[PDB]
């Protein structure tokens, strides 16, 4: 039931074997011959055309890679509930400054 020399020697020999296989393969000048849900994603899009129209586009994504990246943003944006917020902050700063100026007028 070795817990000491057996493990150490086994690791050492596997190390020498891999080192020696890599050296040989790499220095070879031999020529080498040239050789979960199963569910797709479909999106419906509603847009307005020039003049007056309301066409709807149904687009199906069968690439599971595109799927993963697409959904992950929605799930994030669904939990994410901004230029508008920055504008609101600017309005807040303006109001605060006006209030401070009113305070200065009251003091003087």
């Amino acid at each position: 039931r070795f817990s000491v020399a057996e493990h150490q020697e086994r690791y050492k020999e596997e190390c020498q074997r891999i080192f020696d296989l890599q050296n040989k393969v790499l220095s070879s000048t031999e020529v080498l011959s040239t050789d979960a849900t199963g569910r797709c994603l479909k999106i419906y899009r509603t847009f307005r055309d020039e003049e007056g129209k309301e066409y709807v586009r149904c687009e199906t994504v069968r690439k599971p890679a595109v799927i993963d990246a697409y959904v992950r943003i929605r799930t994030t944006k669904d939990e994410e509930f901004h230029r508008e917020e920055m504008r609101k902050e600017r309005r807040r700063i303006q109001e605060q400054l006006r209030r401070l100026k009113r305070n200065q007028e009251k003091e003087k």
């Binding site: 890599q22 050296n23 790499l26 220095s27 000048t29």
Partner: protein
Amino acid sequence: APIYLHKMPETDFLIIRTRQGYYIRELVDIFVVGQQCPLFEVPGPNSKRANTHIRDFLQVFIYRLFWKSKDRPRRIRMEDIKKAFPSHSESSIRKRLKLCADFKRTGMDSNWWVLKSDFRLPTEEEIRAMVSPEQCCAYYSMIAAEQRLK
């Protein structure tokens, strides 16, 4: 890392292109580099060594911008540092400039970060002793692997 000398293919040359033109060398020696045995530890993301390297790299860049300044009170601009490090929040850049510099709003040197008169700007060997190039390579390996995993 173990390297293995191979002769070049008989068809391949090396073209060095610059803005002015193309230049051609032949090559005769090409090594194949095996699996590397790392001697430097790449830090992890958000590690203490990682944040220390980011802070020290920003400080070294700020010192070298102060050395390059020709004004007799050495002065730099903030948006040079914001062009170099655009992912940095400006609170961290102002933290690095808080000691060793001060902001002049009015008069001469206005909208510049002049160097403090009591502050001795470090010499070239001290700035070299701050950050090592191998630490920069370890940081670049960390952020490239961060991108690939992400």
